[PDB]
Design a binder for this molecule. Sequence first.
Ligand SMILES: CCCCCCCC/C=C\CCCCCCCC(=O)OC[C@H](O)CO
Ligand SMILES: CCCCCCCC/C=C\CCCCCCCC(=O)OC[C@H](O)CO
Ligand SMILES: CCCCCCCC/C=C\CCCCCCCC(=O)OC[C@H](O)CO
Ligand SMILES: CCCCCCCC/C=C\CCCCCCCC(=O)OC[C@H](O)CO
Length: 318
Amino acid sequence: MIWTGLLVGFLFGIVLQRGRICFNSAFRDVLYLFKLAVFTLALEMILFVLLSQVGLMQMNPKPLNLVGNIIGGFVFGLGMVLAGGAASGVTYRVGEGLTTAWFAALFYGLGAYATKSGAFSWWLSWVGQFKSPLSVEESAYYVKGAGPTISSVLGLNPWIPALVIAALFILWAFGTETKFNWKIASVCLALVAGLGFITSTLSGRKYGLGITGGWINLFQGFLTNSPLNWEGLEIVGIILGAGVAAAVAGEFKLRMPKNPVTYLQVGIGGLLMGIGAVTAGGCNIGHFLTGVPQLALSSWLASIFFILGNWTMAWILF
Ligand SMILES: CCCCCCCC/C=C\CCCCCCCC(=O)OC[C@H](O)CO
Ligand SMILES: CCCCCCCC/C=C\CCCCCCCC(=O)OC[C@H](O)CO
Ligand SMILES: CCCCCCCC/C=C\CCCCCCCC(=O)OC[C@H](O)CO
Ligand SMILES: CCCCCCCC/C=C\CCCCCCCC(=O)OC[C@H](O)CO
């Protein structure tokens, strides 16, 4: 059943490559992607509580760690701008044929590994002491010991804030040239997110779409001989689906940057991202795309600082 990760990641890479969902150029606002993000977030907000109510799922919000979330998200934004894309853009653009993406994803994997259990694990160990003891109790909506949410703190059934924020986000989007329209893209992305949440919970990992854990699992399987899980097969599926969707659309091509220093630029970027995500407890997918619709406070804070670090590094380079 861990091989359902391959299929979920295949569909994920297809929708990512076709919709061109770049998170690094989404956190930089248009002087399409913003509305795509808000609509996907609202649809996931409704769908997660729906699937948890019908017993197909349980939301598992990530724990709160102010130092962790804040600083890791800032560094993750820095690295995402230095790498020319966050953890999703990089990973799926590997399959499009961009060698820059190859470094970026590879140094991202190495840095995440080193931060979790390697030369940078002292920093993660020091950060872990600021973990918030706040946790929710087991419910039809939440897994026992999960992080605090907007609904849990307000003492409300998750349906209430889910529906209110989601309806406000739909008003949001609909109130203000590709034929893969942003609404159908959001619908397909939310459906893929729900499918991933379900199949991953049945796989043993009670969570939705992620990136960091998949790369860590792949590197661990290659260098440790450990068995791969749902997330590593999901990463391989992301790459495979992005590649297939780019080749069918005639968009696949092995490419190089204009100047070789970009290779040095992205290689550092990914590294920062690897240190960022693991410190922040999540990437642009694990926190923003997956944890925000669960109304996780840690995910919202981590996304805030994703965008802040993005802005800082964007001014530094530009
Ligand atoms: C410093 C960050 C470098 C990032 C490079 C990414 C690519 C990884 C490949 C080789 C790195 C080898 C260097 C590993 C540095 C830590 C090794 C270590 O444990 O250092 C102990 C110390 O030197 C007393 O024994
Ligand atoms: C140039 C940069 C210099 C450094 C500035 C970086 C900006 C972030 C700093 C602090 C945020 C976190 C503040 C720490 C708050 C207290 C520790 C904590 O989070 O504790 C929570 C837990 O419930 C009980 O420990
Ligand atoms: C209407 C749309 C939603 C609006 C609402 C957005 C919800 C807040 C989001 C992110 C902040 C999350 C962190 C908030 C700061 C927590 C700091 C704190 O007090 O933590 C203490 C300690 O860690 C434990 O007791
Ligand atoms: C180049 C321009 C750079 C401009 C500056 C970059 C952005 C700095 C903004 C915010 C830093 C963090 C402040 C956020 C508040 C942290 C304090 C906090 O969360 O405290 C919790 C408390 O400890 C619970 O017990």
